[model samples]
Target: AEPLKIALVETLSGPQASTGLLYRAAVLYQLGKINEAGGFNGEKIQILEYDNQGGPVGAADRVKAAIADGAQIIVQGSSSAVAGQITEDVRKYNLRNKGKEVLYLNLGAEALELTGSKCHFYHFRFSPNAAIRFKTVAQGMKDKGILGERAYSINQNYSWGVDVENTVVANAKEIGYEVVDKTLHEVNKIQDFSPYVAKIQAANVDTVFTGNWSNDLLLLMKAASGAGLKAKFATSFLDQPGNIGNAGAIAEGHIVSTPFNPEANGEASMAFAEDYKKVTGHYPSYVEPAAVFGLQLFGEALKNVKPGEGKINTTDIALAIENASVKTPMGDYSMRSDDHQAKFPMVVQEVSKKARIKADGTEYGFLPFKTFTGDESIDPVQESCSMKRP
Candidate 1:
């Protein structure tokens, strides 16, 4: 029998290509481990990579192509803009094809609407949504007293960006912090944020929150550093692979939140980190472990289904996944039946003034400061999701 084909539609050759590469490396690493262990009941898992150029239109087209090429599962991440397109396409395809459902597993994109009003039966999010992340950030600010009276936000102007700004504003208000200014910049297009940084400095903001990722993040941090901006940066993607390192000493004292924490996740996580470094020649970023977690859930769920008889029934696989739980490097995670959102612990890390070397001896800026358990991290399920229970 042929191996189970999992199509990874991601950004491979754009501004955010590094993110795609990191996710790809993590996925391939897990693929190797699973195949070595006899895979999904003696069959190997085959990965088909597609470069979506970090665009939703391209991602949607790739999903169609992957489905046409016999891929049973579609995994995507990096940009929530692209993830939004792929999820909707998969949902529609599954609806039109009925029993020929193709599962869409999201590893990164955290637009709140994906699991909220736009929730689909065939779509499952392994990463926490914007609401969850912002809520975590809000609580962290209140507890640490890092967020002062005046706050400003700068976000990429897209689906994920809009969601991030809205969540941050709402949460900030709840925590008694006033959002004095909000700005939106083109995603991955801003090479210089000195103008924005100047405005932020002039506002005398207490804390700055941004949802920019990739080049936007790196450039923003660098600009802030050059301008001697004194406000603290509270961000979601500050600790991404090259961002912190590129931002250099300026990244120190910034705040970030992620689901994975390699330092405190026990021996299994440490071993996984060691193996990953050996494979990829770099320490795994926070988002990388999510690929392994996603695949692990899929494989565990596959074990419960009888796929030997014919073409694997994706409906049954979906059922199995919804009813399944797995222990990941981050901790135990389970798919919520109502929204198909994975519940896991999240950690808030502070960028240290001094860089620390990883297991591979690679230096990075961020270090873990506090960990939020699954219950503490995720937001209560919104009543907007109209997904019918199985």
Candidate 2:
């Protein structure tokens, strides 16, 4: 049998390449796992990295070249703006090409619309969207009797950011929090979040919610620390590399909701964390662990699809992916047949020195505050996603 080629189109050489680089590390690590297992029916899975250059236009162009280069599966995770471009192109590409279709295995673009109006049979999301992340973070904080009475929302102006702002504001009444103020600033453009910090202080906000990633999140937290803002941050990307170190002491007590908790499964997860650290020189954090588990789910699907007549049908594999399940180190993970969004467990963690594992070589680590099983936390299929099988 021939090799199964998988291409990773990520922002590898730009300002926001940090997240993409993490995706690259995890995907390659997981790729090693597959090949070590003899790679699904004796055929190895081939992977090549395609840099998106941190732009949608570049992302689209890279996807085309990736397809032309014989990529059977396209893997991407980073900006949702870039994700939208890749998803549409893959949809149209698959429509025009029948048996030669490529599967889009999204590792992290968390825009709500990607699973809403843009949902298709070919696109499958492996990470939680804004709605689920904020909902879990808010509820976790509320359960701990620390949910801020006056909450402020600050985020980058993009699909993911807007979704977070909207979700946080929408869940205000249900989560017993007051929306004191909110701001949607340009993505990765603001060098000075001091003004935003002043606005938050003026609002007398106690808790802050944000979906900003990359420089946006880091710079914003740096500003908050500089301002000595007393508000607790309820963020989606606080576990991203360098965030806690950059936020320094202020990062303590801040809450983050994520799918990858290093200490969640005890020895099982510890085994994974130590193995990943040995290979990558650091413990899994942020989107990395989820990407690894996501690929495991994909491998389960590959096993399900026996590849009749030595011909790998992507349609069959896609269908198989819907039913694929893996007992991940974090917990059970699977794909929703209707919307293609992954159903994975979530962990609400607080930044603390007492955490079992440390990050960024700092005294701080992610201490598990609350854990939610996949079914307990995953959002329901939205009406906007009407899957049409070919």
Candidate 3:
């Protein structure tokens, strides 16, 4: 008889606001659609928004506030450090609160540990982890003949970035690329990437793999272009809006692995893009598509749940979510029951003018290079995840 309550705690202000803002935007778009289709038990879903102010401490505080207000579902994914804090807090909350357990819908924090050692029944990561992204990108580029023998691995110094660094190195021998250079720079503290670009140039890398997002990624691309570095970027966050255009000519041949390809699903994707453009004034880019798709899975599971003549049970929804099947523009998506990781198709896209859906008011957009079905793209559940349910 009560409205379904979802809390959105993200960094809405500060330098990293770009990524968090996108996550919020996607939630608004998808939540609106879900509500229009007769929200859970015909009571419109209600959202509580809180800004974490770009740090884990702030995120934890905001999450505490959300839980105190009786939020049934908490959503976040901008930072893995934040995700770690949230998952721990939520786990503690669930253990202490018994029947009042809350579910965490992780949309973006792509660190491996969220779904690995830290995985729990209440925390479901909808985004691909670093291992999956790096491994998929490595093979996807190799198949497209863009993966070079000598590769440079660079990322910010943090949990997500560290995961990217380790994954890239771990997959080097398997992908047949030599890890020529690796750097873990301070997270979002560097004003100029010229010095790092010098190191990359000195390595003579034919390709570079990075997990830098927001300005770190934007600045890195500009620096690479300024120095005319020949190595192409095979990145996880290149699809973030304004990245390609801001990077200029250097981003042209760069390859990226993403879960959403606006053109890949034809009319299904076309409808999403058109509708998204109407709302956001541009085609969906970067993590937004996957974020929306994750909500759809959550929404689908909610639809199957019975109201039980009271506010729906949280555990029932979480259990249903584990087996949820939802259609997306790209493919069907479901959550893995054992580890609570999402299963969805991933695409390797190259930034080129040939792509129909351009971004950031630029002529270039992501053109699909290779498509990996959901079954083929998702990595096996890590053995470290010994998740026990209620």
State the lDDT at 238 in candidate 2: 87
In each prediction, how many residue pairs overlap at the backbone (N, C-alpha, C within less than 3 A)?
0, 0, 0
Using all chains and alpha carbons, the TM-scores for the candidates as numbered come to 0.90, 0.94, 0.94
Candidate 3 lDDT score at position 217? 87
Scored by TM-score, the top model is: 2
What do the candidate models score in CA lDDT, each in turn?
0.79, 0.87, 0.87
Q: Where is model 1 more than 4 Å wrong at Cα?
A: 1-3, 13-16, 190-192, 306-311, 353-364
Candidates, ranked, TM-score:
2, 3, 1
lDDT minimum window of 10 residues, candidate 3: 241-250
Error of 2 at 96 (Å): 1.4
Model with the higher TM-score, candidate 1 or 2: 2
Q: Candidate 3, residues 31-121: lDDT per residue as tens digits? A: 9889989878668888899988748888889988998887889999877888899999999989999998999999988888888899999
Q: Write the per-residue lDDT of candidate 1 for residues 1-390, one digit (tens) a residue.
A: 656888989887866587788888878887777787777645787889888863888887899999999999998877777887888888888778877789899988888888998797788888878888777866776678787889898898887789889888878756778889999888788787899999999989888888777778778888988999888888887766656546666777888887866665667667777778898876677688777787777767877777656567777888998988888777887788888888788878777744343312234455666678777887778778889553
* Residue-level error in angstroms, candidate 3, position 206: 2.0
At residue 53, candidate 3 shows an lDDT of: 79
